Every structure is written in structure tokens, then in C-alpha cells.
Design a protein around this ligand. Structure first.
Ligand SMILES: NC1(C(=O)N[C@@H](CCO)c2ccc(Cl)cc2)CCN(c2ncnc3[nH]ccc23)CC1
Length: 330
């Protein structure tokens, strides 16, 4: 258990939420930069977020893909869990779309392809369903390639047509079959892909109401509509991804991602080239240094950091000693 919190300099707040914070850090000994997610044990326990936290840890440790965030270290103190991950310097797609309103079909295509590559890997090679696709969880690396973050809602052990039970996800992104609450399969990820790609090309959610009651009714009952400037292949792709019956959805059959990969919207895409990062990103992040946070909301980066500075074997109900938090990537 070599690295500890004292091995890092804490530079800037990147993100914050009910469960904890994510800080831009420098490993002092190497000069390398990372995003460190710091969670308070007491909070995770109180909010029944333990299982999610442990799932993210396992999924990160078990996965290696161009478009998935890589984990460098995970470790714990008596009161905290720390995940030291590759820093996605280009920020959230949420940040960009908020400012730009829409992406071109070509730009949405590039992101869509990298997302499909990542999800295909998870489904096919890892038997993992992601369940939480949304613009906040889709980040850009310094070169402009996708990095998916936040694996806490994943389900492991989902092979082929195996089903899942848990009601989870983000309300505006929930698939009809999730809302029905009578079991669902891996095609929930393709609904999620539909929502994000719809947002990218159309500049709004496919279904929205500030009241969750009304929102859920729309998702279940309302036929999809598109702005009339949307091209025919994009309309076709989104229509297929946003079919309410997962059995009728693009990606919803035995071939899974391969059905999406073959859709005419992605005609000409060479999928091995996607994997190899041989497509030139349409937007290159213009960061001037390894610490430039221009693609992060000032609401976060303006905040002051004061990290709190024996107890190595302490294992309590409120602050447990958790398993698999002695990780350093080989
Ligand atoms: N999308 C990020 C984020 O704040 N996510 C939100 C959830 C979605 O709204 C978040 C807030 C707080 C916490 Cl503890 C975890 C996740 C941006 C800041 N984060 C990162 N920033 C830059 N590089 C990163 N690599 C790994 C994570 C990360 C965490 C993910």
C-alpha cells in the first residue's frame, strides 16, 4: 500500500456532488496529473451508495479500453475512498453542448461511434451493462476523444439476454422498460445512446417535463418527434434507438452493438479505426497546460480546496475498511 493522500498536490475542484468531490491533482514524485475522486465513507454508508461505489471500483480495475476512463490508483484512509483516474482535460460533453446548443451530424457521428465502441466492449467482452449514459458522464480527453466516466450504476455478469431488476439511472434518460419495472436487458444502453445522440443533433432532450410524473408518461407514451432540419439517416438511427419496445430497438437483438454499427448513419466508418483512434476528432481541446481547466464550470473550479491532512486498521459500521482498495495499475 505505497501511495497515500500525501503523495499528491491538490490543484483545482473539477466536480462535486452529494457523495463527494473530484479534484485535479499532481503526483509529486512523477509530475503526472490525474483526477482524484474523494468520497467520505460516512456519506456513502448513510446514503446507501456503498454497492455502487464498490461496483465502480471493480469495473475500473477490470476494464481497459480507449474510450473508458483508466484507473491509476485506488486506496482508502480511515474516513475516505480515493480513486486516482486519468484526467479528461476536454471536459464534459454537457459543458460543450450547453454553450454550442447543437453539434453537427458529423461531430455527433464521431462521438456516437466511440461510445458504441466502448459499449460493445462492455457488453461483449466484460458482460457489463452501463445503465447511466448521459452528457455529464461523456467526457473528452486532451486530444478530443471520448472518455466515459462514472461506472457506479453498472451491472456485472450480464451475458447475452440475461435480465436486470434494479430501478436506477437518471430520470430524463430512463428507458421505457426501466420505468415499467418488470425486468430489462442490455438494450437499455442503446436507449441511452439514442437520448445522448438526440441531444447532440437536436439540441434538447427527446422527452422533458420538470415534473417526473409527466416526464415518465412522455417516455412511456409519447411518439418521438424531430426538428425538420434533421437528415434522413440521423432520423432513422434515432428512431431505431428510441423504440419503446426493447425487442424492436436497434441493438435490441442477439447481435447487440453490431446492428447499430451496420446502420447507414455510420456508413463508411471502419470500426477497427475507431478503436485505434485513427479518426481525427472534429473538436480539439485548446488547453495551454496540463492544469488548464477552461472546459470545466467555474462554479466548481473557483472553489477553494482544503483537504484535511494511527488508524489504518479501523473498521467501523459508519467507516468500514473496504475490500479491493489497495490498487496500483501494473
Ligand atoms: N463528469 C465529472 C463529474 O463531475 N461527474 C459528476 C456526476 C455527473 O454529474 C460527479 C460529481 C461528483 C462525484 Cl464525487 C462524482 C461524479 C467531471 C469531473 N470529473 C472528472 N473530471 C475530469 N477528469 C476525470 N476523470 C475521471 C473523472 C473525472 C468527475 C466526472
Amino acid at each position: 500500500s505505497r501511495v497515500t493522500m500525501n503523495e499528491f498536490e491538490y490543484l483545482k475542484l473539477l466536480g462535486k456532488g452529494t457523495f463527494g468531490k473530484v479534484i485535479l491533482v499532481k503526483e509529486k514524485a512523477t509530475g503526472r496529473y490525474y483526477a482524484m475522486k474523494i468520497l467520505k465513507k460516512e456519506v456513502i454508508v448513510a446514503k446507501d451508495e456503498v454497492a455502487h461505489t464498490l461496483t465502480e471500483n471493480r469495473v475500473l480495475q477490470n476494464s481497459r479500453h480507449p474510450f473508458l476512463t483508466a484507473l491509476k490508483y485506488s486506496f482508502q484512509t480511515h474516513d475516505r475512498l480515493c480513486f486516482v483516474m486519468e484526467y479528461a482535460n476536454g471536459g464534459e460533453l454537457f459543458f460543450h453542448l450547453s454553450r454550442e446548443r447543437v453539434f453537427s451530424e458529423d461531430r455527433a457521428r464521431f462521438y456516437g461511434a466511440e461510445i458504441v465502441s466502448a459499449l460493445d466492449y462492455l457488453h461483449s467482452e466484460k458482460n457489463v451493462v452501463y445503465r447511466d449514459l448521459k452528457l455529464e458522464n461523456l467526457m473528452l480527453d486532451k486530444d478530443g476523444h471520448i472518455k466515459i466516466t462514472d461506472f457506479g450504476l453498472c451491472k456485472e455478469g450480464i451475458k447475452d439476454g440475461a435480465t436486470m431488476k434494479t430501478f436506477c439511472g437518471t430520470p430524463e434518460y430512463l428507458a421505457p422498460e426501466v420505468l415499467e419495472d418488470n425486468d430489462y436487458g442490455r438494450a437499455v444502453d442503446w436507449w441511452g445512446l439514442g437520448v445522448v445522440m438526440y441531444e447532440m443533433m437536436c439540441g434538447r432532450l427527446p422527452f422533458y417535463n420538470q415534473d417526473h410524473e409527466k416526464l415518465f408518461e412522455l417516455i412511456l407514451m409519447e411518439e418521438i418527434r424531430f426538428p425538420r432540419t434533421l437528415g434522413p439517416e440521423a432520423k432513422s438511427l434515432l428512431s431505431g434507438l428510441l423504440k419503446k419496445d426493447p425487442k424492436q430497438r436497434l441493438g435490441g437483438g442477439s447481435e447487440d452493438a453490431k446492428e447499430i454499427m451496420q446502420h447507414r448513419f455510420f456508413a463508411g466508418i471502419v470500426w477497427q479505426h475507431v478503436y485505434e483512434k485513427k479518426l481525427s476528432p472534429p473538436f480539439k481541446p485548446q488547453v495551454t497546460s496540463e492544469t488548464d481547466t477552461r472546459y470545466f464550470d467555474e462554479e466548481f473550479t473557483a472553489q477553494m480546496i482544503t483537504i484535511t491532512p494511527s488508524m489504518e486498521c479501523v473498521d467501523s459500521e459508519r467507516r468500514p475498511h473496504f475490500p479491493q482498495f489497495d490498487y496500483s495499475a501494473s
